Amino acid sequence: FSKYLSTAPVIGTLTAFFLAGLLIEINRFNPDLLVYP
Amino acid sequence: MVQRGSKVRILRKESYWYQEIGTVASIDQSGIKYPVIVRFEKVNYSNVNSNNFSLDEVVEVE
Amino acid sequence: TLNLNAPTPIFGGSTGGLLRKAEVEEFYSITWTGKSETVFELPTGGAAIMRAGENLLRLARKEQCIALGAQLKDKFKITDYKIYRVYPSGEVQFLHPKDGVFPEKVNPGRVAVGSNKRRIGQNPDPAKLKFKGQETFDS
Amino acid sequence: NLPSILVPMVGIVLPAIVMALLFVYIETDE
Amino acid sequence: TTIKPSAQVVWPIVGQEILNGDVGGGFQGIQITSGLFQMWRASGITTELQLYVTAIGALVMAALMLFAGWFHYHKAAPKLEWFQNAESMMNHHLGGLFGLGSLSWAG
Amino acid sequence: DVAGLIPCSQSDAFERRLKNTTQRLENRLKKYEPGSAPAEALQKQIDKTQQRFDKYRNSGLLCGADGLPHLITDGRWSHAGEFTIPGLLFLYIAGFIGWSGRSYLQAVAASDNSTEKEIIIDIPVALQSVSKGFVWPLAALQEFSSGKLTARDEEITISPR
Amino acid sequence: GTKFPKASQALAQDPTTRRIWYGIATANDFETNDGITEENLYQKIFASHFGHLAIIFLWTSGNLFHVAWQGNFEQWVKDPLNTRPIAHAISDPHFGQRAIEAFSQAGASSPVNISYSGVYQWWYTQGMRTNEELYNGAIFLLILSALSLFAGWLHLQPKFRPNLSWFKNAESRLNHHLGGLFGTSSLAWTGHIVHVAIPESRGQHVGWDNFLQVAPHPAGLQPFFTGNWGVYTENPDTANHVFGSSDGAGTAILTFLGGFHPQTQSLWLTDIAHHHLAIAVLFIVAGHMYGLYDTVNNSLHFQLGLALAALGVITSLVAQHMYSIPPYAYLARDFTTQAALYTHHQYIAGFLMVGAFAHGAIFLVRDYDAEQNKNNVLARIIDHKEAIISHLSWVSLFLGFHTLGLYVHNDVVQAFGTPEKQILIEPVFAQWIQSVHGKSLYGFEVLLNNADSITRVAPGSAQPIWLPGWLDAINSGNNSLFLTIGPGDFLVHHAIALGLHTTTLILVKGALDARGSKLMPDKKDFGYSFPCDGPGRGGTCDISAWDAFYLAVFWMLNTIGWTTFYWHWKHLGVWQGNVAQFNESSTYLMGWFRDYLWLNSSQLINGYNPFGMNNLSVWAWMFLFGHLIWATGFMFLISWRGYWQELIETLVWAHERTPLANLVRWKDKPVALSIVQARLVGLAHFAVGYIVTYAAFLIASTASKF
Amino acid sequence: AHTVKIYDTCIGCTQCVRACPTDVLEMVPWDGCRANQIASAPRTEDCVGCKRCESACPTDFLSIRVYLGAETTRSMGLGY
Amino acid sequence: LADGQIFTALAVALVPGILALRLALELYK
Ligand code: CLA
Ligand code: CLA
Ligand SMILES: CC1=C(/C=C/C(C)=C/C=C/C(C)=C/C=C/C=C(C)/C=C/C=C(C)/C=C/C2=C(C)CCCC2(C)C)C(C)(C)CCC1
Ligand SMILES: CC1=C(C/C=C(\C)CCC[C@H](C)CCC[C@H](C)CCCC(C)C)C(=O)c2ccccc2C1=O
Ligand code: SF4
Ligand code: SF4
Ligand code: SF4
């Protein structure tokens, strides 16, 4: 099952699930970041 | 003169593996034209890995 | 030869075969001996029944004869199919096997027609053969 | 008045003529 | 008539909480067009507890079907002759699946 | 003031976008029950709006005649945070993902089954290339100087001429 | 065995319908004919150019005649501020009674077409005033086209055939075309402006009978020989002077005031007089001057690609300069024609620029010889052709990833009730260049906004005289000289830059890969146009150099579609005085959709309602007519051949078995359209439907409002 | 008819002959070796141009080529 | 215009019409 999670669709998804949720949580505490202040 | 197992570079300009590295699987011990059989890591569009070349189309980069 | 008349298979059908092109010029006929009374698909629609025979079938295209001649070699292993093309309202008798053997088998006495003594990367540029009757692949 | 004569001549009649000579020139043979 | 049917509340993030519109009463969400509010009223449902247990009732049924697919391939897989019996299959699906399914729903 | 753009703290069209955004939410609030749960989500929406106008006023942005903040890329250092500063912040992150996947493929290709390790990703070799990917602006400098960042044209395959 | 086509005798043995279609397509391809020689080849090119030259003369005589006969040219000279120009009278038997009342427009008694080519504006400034003057021009161009069709037949006679060495001698060709054709005929056109067009603009009738009597200047040609050329720069037409009368006119003939006329918003004719004068002097002195030259001279397709590249660049040059610098009186005020004139030449310039790379690609299969052409500029661009395509693969993909995402950002952000969060990039680089050219609206204050800069001052010889005229135009917001741009104009120019890079990417893909790849190394053995190499090697559909042209015709239509949608909507707020509609709505793609395609196509689409019909119902018909022909090309594009070949093999059956129709027999065996054939057929219906639909929309959305 | 030319990089694999649906090709002994073979196309008038003989050739950039020439009734594959 | 000028223009248009027919019958040859 660990050798299944190393396959491309799952590790393409959970890291994209990680990188999206990184960006989602950023816009909740830091909303509307147009420019560097 | 190329021997078996020698890593060659292909000078046949029409080939899919032109200017690429391959290892000679065998040579034919007769006077047949194109005797040099090279096996390649990369498959062409017909998904094969071997071809018959001559000694004029290969070198001895080893 | 064509051995016409020879018995057509017990078929009765097929809109899809042997229209007005056949009576003016060039229809074909495939002749075989089928070693059963079994059913086989036609290139027109599908069934007939192969006779004991001397079986013969008049087809429109040579492409439909080799497609049926492949089915008799595949499914029934009767490889004795012998196609023809007809007389005065046709062109050329005895199309296959052209030299008494199948073309995938080697036969001495054949001559290499359409052979080239060069590779394909050794083909000349068309600018070298411009405004001449030569073509960039003929030798 | 000259529009009423000319536009059914090259709108109808003159294409039907050049269609006829072309269709004979196509389907003729040496 | 007055209140628009709604589910799928949208989270207060980058501005998609403008989709949580004035849909009716004291609720804010997406006006849905699936007719589940009219299907559940015809089924007789009056409180959200009867919807909550049916959502649990489908998930245990989902696990029941998923276990049955594991069981009927890995453990107890029927032969070919169990599948080619179309007359007993037509007998069972007509009276049992379609008949009792419309008999029990008539109840 | 680089193209007739008045700053947004004194731009009256930008200060009038706030007057109509909250008036379109206060009238959305005026019908609901004051202690209700959709009432507090509109005040969370009203105050999230006030946290972007006060964030854009004090940041020194440039609002036009419409009243929307315009960005100035010629890069000036007084307007460096628009494109130059997050652009540099972009380029390290994208080159990190770039040099990681390039370092992964050179390690995998000199193995027994290279195409197998592209499907199932070796978490040793994957986390190794992340370690070789954080140092990429330094790592590509000695890679380009060594001669092994690029290949000569007698080694690549090339269409016939 | 038939005779048609005479060109390809191997097509004549084809007994199907393909012979009919391929006879029309291999027709004017003169290198493909059997038995052709290169000496016989160029003479057929030379006579065909005479046949083409007459068609341009017969077409212009038709435009002159139908304005002289069925137009209102004399009625329009007296008042170009209210009178709409009439193209030709309508005579269709299919009209109704309520339609003749609706197409009897511009106050005429007969159904007429309101002209949108603006040859009224062009001939009004060439000097013409009366309907008889246009008819004399139509008579004259029937003589020139007769001169063209005679000389084409004449130069095929065996005593008047030009030699092959006369054709391939380009050294004397460039001396004469820049010298005679470009220089003297610009010096001749300089004679037309000073003798005719300048006094006709000042109230004086100058025709063929009286022009030898009256002189263009009160001191005619006496200071041309002593060197005192400055006396032609006397009192010009003032700001008081209305066009076409003696109301405060002048006597100057070669002035360089710059700027525009204060009432027609057009160029001064004295500027155009001094313009083509100096163009003549440069082209005259440029014609006294005369292993790659052995390639360009030998190859007919090389010079054709360079000509279409030269034509395609200068055709965009017309459209970009004609709307900002209106060269014709009352063309700036005619909004529909100005819109139709930009969109005309830009769509042609795209077709000329695509055909430039197309004919260079034909050169590389037919005429290019890599054993003879080695180590020059040509055989080096082929040598690193993978480096050019991949770097064009980047800048296509670099812009399209970002200027789409810049739009989808502004869409989503505006949709969420927050327009104040958009990424609006002010185009400071181009706004510098307008401030470099003198537009003091922004306030950059260098280079001709700098009043003390060395370019505006010119401290060498006190030169700067044309800058008072230019700087009163670009700073004034009454015309289209260097339009005020904002962040919406940023996003479109990078869509445009995406289009010119992508269309080049496809066109130089099949150009450089016309001679072979790893897929098909022998692509020069199969020609420029051929469908595929089968389903082997993974399948090779659309592989050829013809099908790389064919994909870029979609891209040029899309690029000019991006271009002329931006031209039209920017000017629809400039002309209407509401510039703010393009200001806020063009930053996001819904305002491009709602406020341009939906808002402006309302009065078009009510061309015929169930309560009546308007004069726009010919445009509302041709709108839907253009949708239907565009969608039909999809049928030949999506569905491919062997569906239809097996559909005709049953219609052949149903025709051979139907009684009373079994007797009627074809001579050509009906087949499906070929693979290369219906790519062209599908692209033709696509390209015609692309152009017919916009031309109906661009006309009717502007004629309804102006 | 379509032209079929067989180049000398063929190996006598016999695969293009048995992949021909219209029986154009055949195998023939070779001159300079008298042991190996080569394909040959003596019946090019029958060729429909399907290029199935190129899909079966094992050599890198196949030794048998098909150039679609003039279209007769056989090469158009017409049943009428 | 005048009515006689229209039939004059149609008369002088026969001169390109024979010449276009004469050129195309030579270009075909
Ligand atoms: C482009 C040239 C053109 C012109 C000038 C016309 C003209 C006409 N068409 Mg149209 N039509 C055309 C092309 C054209 N058609 C095309 C391309 C289509 C396909 C889209 C149509 C589809 C169409 C339909 C369905 C109908 C018309 C009709 C008409 C007539 C309407 C006015 C009328 O009824 O007068 C009154 C006059 C008559 C009713 C009789 C006219 C004299 C007849 C046609 C000829 C007499 C025979 C004569 C001895 C020798 C033949 C001469 C003839 C070939 C010119 C008018 C004659 C209507 C019609 O009446 O058709 C005949 C009609 O129903 N058209
Ligand atoms: C003056 C410039 C010029 C010249 C001299 C040529 C000349 C030639 N071209 Mg080139 N070319 C040009 C410009 C030019 N072209 C342009 C502008 C393009 C881009 C559009 C091309 C793209 C191109 C390609 C891809 C090819 C050529 C080819 C040729 C050769 C044969 C043409 C032929 O026989 O087709 C026959 C003509 C037709 C089939 C015309 C029908 C198509 C038109 C557009 C239909 C119009 C639609 C319809 C009528 C609209 C109705 C209106 C509606 C309202 C109803 C000939 C050498 C071919 C060649 O092989 O060269 C050796 C070739 O393959 N050209
Ligand atoms: C492929 C091929 C081909 C083709 C090509 C082509 C098609 C191209 C195109 C291209 C193009 C078509 C180009 C263009 C160019 C342009 C340019 C490059 C321009 C420039 C400009 C400039 C330089 C300007 C500047 C300026 C300004 C802006 C202002 C100030 C001053 C001045 C004037 C300086 C041929 C045929 C050869 C053949 C072979 C192959
Ligand atoms: C419909 C269709 C056919 C069938 C089309 C046929 C058989 C042609 C039928 C068209 C008829 C003859 C009407 C055409 C009439 C035109 C309006 C004018 C043609 C004459 C010009 C020379 C002016 C194909 O053969 C085909 C092939 C490849 C891809 C797509 C398709 C495809 O979509
Ligand atoms: S017909 Fe089209 S899809 Fe089929 S093999 Fe030929 S090119 Fe490929
Ligand atoms: S198909 Fe080509 S490679 Fe194969 S046997 Fe025939 S000639 Fe040789
Ligand atoms: S193209 Fe088809 S029919 Fe012709 S030789 Fe090849 S396989 Fe046989």
Question: Beta strands F69-71 and G424-425: pairing type?
Answer: parallel
Q: Position G465: which residue type?
A: I
List residues near ligand 3 (CB under 6 A): G 302, 305-306, 309, 313, 356-357, 360, 363-364, 511
Q: Is residue E5 helix, strand or coil? A: coil
Q: How was this structure determined?
A: cryo-EM
Contact yes or no for C118/H7 (Cβ under 8 A): yes
Distances in Å between the alpha carbon of G388 and those of G100, G361, G498, G505? 59, 15, 16, 9
Residue F56: both structure tokens together: 């854009």
Question: Beta strands E21-24 and E27-31: pairing type?
Answer: antiparallel
Q: Position C13: which residue type?
A: G
CA dihedral G683, G687, G689, G690 (to 10 degrees): 130
CA dihedral G347, G351, G352, G358 (to 10 degrees): 160
Helices and strands (DSSP H and E) totals, chain F: 6, 3
Q: Which DSSP symbol is given to H45?
A: G
I16 to chain G, closest Cα gap in Å = 5
Identify the H or E element spanning E21.
strand E21-24
F121 with A11: Cβ contact below 8 A: yes
G66 to chain D, closest Cα gap in Å = 12
What backbone torsions phi and psi does residue B33 show, to the nearest 5 degrees? -70, 150
Which residues, in sequence order, are CB contacts of G28 under 8 Å at separation 6+? G48
Characterize A2-17 residue by residue with b for buried, 16 or more Cβ atoms within 10 angstroms of its Cβ, and e for exposed: eeeeeeeeeeeeeeee
Q: Å resolution of this model?
A: 3.3
Q: Is residue C85 helix, strand or coil? A: strand
Contact yes or no for G180/G64 (Cβ under 8 A): no
Residue F117: both structure tokens together: 């390790």
Question: Beta strands B21-26 and B36-39: pairing type?
Answer: antiparallel
I1 with G143: Cβ contact below 8 A: no
Contact yes or no for A19/E2 (Cβ under 8 A): no
Which residues, in sequence order, are CB contacts of G537 under 8 Å at separation 6+? B44, B45, B46, G519, G520, H54
Do C and A make contact via 3 or more CB pairs under 8 A? The reply is: no
**Residue count (chain B):** 62
C137 with G652: Cβ contact below 8 A: no
Q: Which DSSP symbol is given to B13?
A: T
Question: Beta strands C55-59 and F62-63: pairing type?
Answer: unpaired
Q: What is the CA G481 to chain-centroid distance, rounded?
A: 21
The verdict on the CB of residue G28 being under 6 Å from ligand 2 is: yes
Spell out the alpha helix ranges (H) of G416-486: 428-437, 454-457, 467-474
The verdict on the CB of residue H6 being under 6 Å from ligand 7 is: no
E/G interface, count of CB pairs below 8 Å = 8
Cα(G673) to centroid of ligand 4, in Å? Answer: 6
Spell out the alpha helix ranges (H) of G71-96: 73-77
**How far apart, in whole angstroms, are the C-alpha atoms of residue C130 and residue C78?**
51
What backbone torsions phi and psi does residue G4 show, to the nearest 5 degrees? -75, 135
Cα(G673) to centroid of ligand 5, in Å? Answer: 14
Which residues, in sequence order, are CB contacts of F16 under 8 Å at separation 6+? F67
Domain ranges of chain B: 1-62
Q: How many CA atoms lie within 13 A of B5 on its CB side?
A: 0
What backbone torsions phi and psi does residue C86 show, to the nearest 5 degrees? -80, 180
What backbone torsions phi and psi does residue C89 show, to the nearest 5 degrees? -80, 25
Residue C14: both structure tokens together: 């097929």
Sort residue G535 into left (φ over 0), alpha (ψ -120 to 50) or beta: alpha
What backbone torsions phi and psi does residue H67 show, to the nearest 5 degrees? -115, 115
The strand ranges marked E within chain H are 3-6, 26-29, 37-40, 64-67
Which residues, in sequence order, are CB contacts of F123 under 8 Å at separation 6+? A6
The strand ranges marked E within chain C are 28-32, 55-59, 82-85
Q: Is residue F15 helix, strand or coil? A: helix
Residue A21: both structure tokens together: 């949720």
A29 touches chain G (CB under 8 A): no
Residue C60: both structure tokens together: 């429109």
G669 with H80: Cβ contact below 8 A: yes
Do B and E make contact via 3 or more CB pairs under 8 A? The reply is: no
Contact yes or no for G329/G121 (Cβ under 8 A): yes
Using CA coordinates, name the residue in chain E closest to A33: E14
**Best substitution site from H3, H6, H24 to test ligand 7's pocket, by max atoms within 8 Å of Cβ?**
H24
